[PDB]
Amino acid sequence: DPDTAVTNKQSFSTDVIYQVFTDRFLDGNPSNNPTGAAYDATCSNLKLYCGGDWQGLINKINDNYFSDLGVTALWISQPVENIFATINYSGVTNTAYHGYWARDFKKTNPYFGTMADFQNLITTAHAKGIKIVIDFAPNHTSPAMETDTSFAENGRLYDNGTLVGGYTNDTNGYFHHNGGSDFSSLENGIYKNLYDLADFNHNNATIDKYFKDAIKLWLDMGVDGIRVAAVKHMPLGWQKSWMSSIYAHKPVFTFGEWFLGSAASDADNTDFANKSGMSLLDFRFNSAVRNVFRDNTSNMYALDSMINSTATDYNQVNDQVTFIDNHDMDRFKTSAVNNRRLEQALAFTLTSRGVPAIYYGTEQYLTGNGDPDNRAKMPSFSKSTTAFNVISKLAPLRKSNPAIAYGSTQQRWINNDVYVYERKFGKSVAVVAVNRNLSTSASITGLSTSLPTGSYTDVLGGVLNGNNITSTNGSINNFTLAAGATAVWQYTTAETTPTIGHVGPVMGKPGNVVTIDGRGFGSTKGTVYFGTTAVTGAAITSWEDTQIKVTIPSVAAGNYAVKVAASGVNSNAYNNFTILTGDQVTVRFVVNNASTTLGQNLYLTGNVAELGNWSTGSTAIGPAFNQVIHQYPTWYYDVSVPAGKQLEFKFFKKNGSTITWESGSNHTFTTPASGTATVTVNWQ
């Protein structure tokens, strides 16, 4: 299958995601609707169910609404069973319509549908070439009050009907009872409750085993991707460990929600993206896009700078999910924002790097500020709006032009209001010009591109006032970019040299199968390179021009570059591919008496790649925590680490340059065969 098929659960670069709140889209089945205070047919009280379901989704798939719009994947509300109780917040009745207050991850929300409906949705979606991505929130159950079991459902958790435990009288410690996060530190938001949501204690082996089993079920149902909710609030170590379990079973594209409030780089965010095993929603791309297109608080340079900085910060920037709005923020469209601005923003998003996601209703210009107004019912299924048109013209390009899907980005011309960027990959090119000025046009002279000699036509057909151009060996002739104009020009050709577009996942242990997508691989099974190790033969489970599935070899745990040698020609190296020691388990390391100096931090390192292999640099573990679960001078940290292996490890203090290690011999511990563990040591 090509990189381009719906069969490609490992890569969404060629896809366009449509984010839909199941409840607010379409009620294909009224029989499954809630009753009483929980239901509102007019869908005027946005905190109540409105009946949207999977059958509604199925219906629109079948009448090609999505196929005509161009979207190739659907991201839906968390499918699991939620609390049935209603919650009264300062007089207002709230329901679990959003799907985020789960009570049983082994079952479906019956208001959405049944196992059969779900299986029917996956099949119908696949028959039309639409991948299905599910929201999943392993961070918590639902709102709960420790001192009041009657509020909501006391955050109870059921394992397929069977009660596992509630927040009150939690003798086994399935949850954290450290109060609620004040968001003052990273440690704080991880070990304390997100709002009033009962917080899971993933160090509890039952909870760790519940989530592995739970996700395994949905992957088996055929899901093609996962949106992990609130990744900033669970320990990276547990999630990494969970990610490898998924990748070892049935690898699917996985991205997570790490909320950022600006285009600015965040060290914790970058680390996560680069070390967890999953990618992230790009809140940095979102701020710059909104700042420039919607709010007018920044200009074209800001946009360009965000393109350059994120590409520098993330190991795989192409794995980041972009968007112009979502259910946790004001709809892009507002009274002061014009339609052309919304349309230009989509055009930018759809031709830029990453995996584009469109919040439902954008094409209908849906308005709505805040929660839940930004979660209004899908008002129309019109295929006439320009917004709708722009998406149907551009979306397919991610499929047809590999430069959009896998290419690099380069500025070709710019100023306060104008931005002309270029996407390239092999001989294929795509050039985009955006003039955000709604009242005045710009004379563009001296524009150079990679477009071979020839005259080009706007791929938008001029719907966004685009013009056609002429290149003379990349030299574009002077032209005027009309007001509020945006034109897309492109050039595509067959690649003749093996060239890697994407590898996914980019983490795994020996035995796992990874997918390498690109061009020019040829149809004659060659050799795949993991660093210096050449993988040939039956290990390469498939080999075609745009996709190779290959088994990760038994080489030392570490960082590698993937190269594909096709017919004697070696391709480009796809860097930072992480090979693990083997299966993971999550171990909490605790150290007593590690007192420090103003600005000194505690780290950890040991004899396995997962512990940094005695490194004190960016591969060491830390800085350790010292506030919630354990207080200074006791530090602790959850680390994904190989299973049933004997590790040697030592802690070290580091402020600036000076590294001070623990004296004595290394500490030792033999990690468990499965699940989780805790090992406490005293600073030597």
Ligand X SMILES: OC[C@H]1O[C@H](O[C@H]2[C@H](O)[C@@H](O)[C@H](O)O[C@@H]2CO)[C@H](O)[C@@H](O)[C@@H]1O
- Which stretch, 7-15, 47-55, 151-159, 559-567, contacts Ca ion (CB under 5 A)? 47-55
Q: Describe the crossing of helices 236-249 and 267-275 by its angle, rounded to 10 degrees.
A: 30
Q: How far is the CB of 326 from ligand GLC (least distance, A)?
A: 9
Q: Which is nearer to ligand X, 381 or 652 (CB)?
A: 652
Q: How far is the CB of 75 from ligand GLC (least distance, A)?
A: 15
Q: Which is nearer to ligand GLC, 9 or 232 (CB)?
A: 232
Q: How far is the CB of 136 from ligand X (least distance, A)?
A: 10
Q: Using CA atoms, how far apart are residues 18 and 76, in angstroms rounded to an integer?
A: 8
Beta-sheet strand order (sheet of 428-435) = 408-414, 418-425, 428-435, 486-491
Is residue 230 a contact point for ligand GLC (CB under 6 A)?
Answer: yes
Q: Using CA atoms, how far apart are residues 548 and 568, in angstroms rounded to an integer?
A: 17
Q: How far is the CB of 376 from ligand GLC (least distance, A)?
A: 17
β strands within 208-287, DSSP E: 225-228, 253-256, 279-280
Contacting residue, 130, 230, 376, 621, with ligand X by CB under 6 A: 230
* Cβ atoms 506, 560 nearer than 8 A: no
Report the partner that residue 232 touches, choosing among ligand X, Ca ion, ligand GLC, none (CB closer than 5 to 8 A by kind): ligand GLC
Is residue 268 a contact point for ligand GLC (CB under 6 A)?
Answer: no
**DSSP state letter for 373:** G
Q: Which residue has the tokens 């949501």?
A: 197
Which helix (H) or strand (E) segment is 18 a member of? strand 17-20
Q: How far is the CB of 194 from ligand GLC (least distance, A)?
A: 6
Q: How far is the CB of 193 from Ca ion (least distance, A)?
A: 7
Contacting residue, 650, 653, 654, 667, with ligand X by CB under 6 A: 650
Is residue 24 a contact point for ligand X (CB under 6 A)?
Answer: no
Site pattern 230..269 for Ca ion (x: CB under 5 A): ---x------------------------------------
Residue 482's CB: how many other CB atoms inside 10 A?
18
Contacting residue, 54, 66, 75, 100, with ligand X by CB under 6 A: 100
Q: How far is the CB of 178 from Ca ion (least distance, A)?
A: 10
* Cβ atoms 613, 593 nearer than 8 A: no
How many chain residues interact with ligand GLC (CB under 6 A)? Answer: 6
> Which residues 321-350 are close enough to bind ligand X by CB under 6 A?
327-328
> Which residues 603-642 are close enough to bind ligand X by CB under 6 A?
614
Residue 558, Ramachandran bin (φ over 0: left; ψ between -120 and 50: alpha; else beta): left
Q: How far is the CB of 343 from ligand X (least distance, A)?
A: 26
Site pattern 617..656 for Ca ion (x: CB under 5 A): ----------------------------------------
Q: Using CA atoms, how far apart are residues 353 and 406, in angstroms rounded to an integer?
A: 7
Report the partner that residue 563 touches, choosing among ligand GLC, ligand X, Ca ion, none (CB closer than 5 to 8 A by kind): none
Q: Which residue has the tokens 């802690």?
A: 651
Contacting residue, 20, 48, 130, 229, with ligand X by CB under 6 A: 229
Is residue 654 a contact point for ligand X (CB under 6 A)?
Answer: no
Which helix (H) or strand (E) segment is 402 a member of? helix 402-406
The strand pair at 321-322 and 635-642 is best described as: unpaired
Contacting residue, 170, 199, 363, 422, with Ca ion by CB under 5 A: 199
Report the partner that residue 27 touches, choosing among ligand GLC, Ca ion, ligand X, none (CB closer than 5 to 8 A by kind): Ca ion
**Assigned token pair, 300:** 């074209």
If you write DSSP's letter for every residue of 569-587 in order, what string do you get? Answer: EE---EEEEEEPSSSEEEE
Residue (of 533, 530, 539) closest to 503 by Cα position? 530
Residue type, 613: N
> Which residues 245-304 are close enough to bind ligand X by CB under 6 A?
257
Q: Is 381 exposed, middle or buried (0-12, 13-18, 19+ CB in 10 A)?
A: middle
How many chain residues interact with Ca ion (CB under 5 A)? Answer: 8
How many chain residues interact with ligand X (CB under 6 A)? Answer: 18
- Which stretch, 24-32, 348-356, 414-422, 647-655, contacts Ca ion (CB under 5 A)? 24-32
Contacting residue, 259, 381, 614, 661, with ligand GLC by CB under 6 A: 259
Q: Which is nearer to Ca ion, 232 or 327 (CB)?
A: 232
Residue nearest to ligand GLC (CB): 230
The strand pair at 574-579 and 355-359 is best described as: unpaired
Q: How far is the CB of 93 from ligand X (least distance, A)?
A: 14
Report the partner that residue 51 touches, choosing among ligand GLC, ligand X, Ca ion, none (CB closer than 5 to 8 A by kind): Ca ion
- Which stretch, 1-9, 190-198, 500-508, 585-593, contacts ligand X (CB under 6 A)? 190-198
Is residue 371 a contact point for ligand X (CB under 6 A)?
Answer: yes
Residue 302's CB: how many other CB atoms inside 10 A?
16
H-only helix segments in 103-226: 115-127, 186-191, 205-220
Collapse the DSSP code of 134 into the 3-class scheme (helix H, G, I; strand E, B; otherwise coil) and give the result: strand
Collapse the DSSP code of 258 into the 3-class scheme (helix H, G, I; strand E, B; otherwise coil) and give the result: coil
User: How many helices and strands (H and E) does the chain possess?
Assistant: 14, 42
Q: Which is nearer to Ca ion, 26 or 552 (CB)?
A: 26
Give the CA dihedral 200, 205, 207, 209, nearest 10 degrees: 150
Which helix (H) or strand (E) segment is 589 a member of? strand 584-592
Written in H, E and C, the secondary structure of 640-676 is: EEECCCEEEEEEEEECCCCEEECCCCCEEEECCCCCE
Q: Rule CB under 6 A: which residues touch ligand X?
A: 98, 100, 137, 143, 194-195, 197, 229-230, 257, 327-328, 371, 614, 650, 661, 663, 666
Q: Rule CB under 5 A: which residues touch Ca ion?
A: 27, 32-33, 51, 53, 139, 199, 233
Q: Rule CB under 6 A: which residues touch ligand GLC?
A: 194, 230, 232, 257, 259, 328
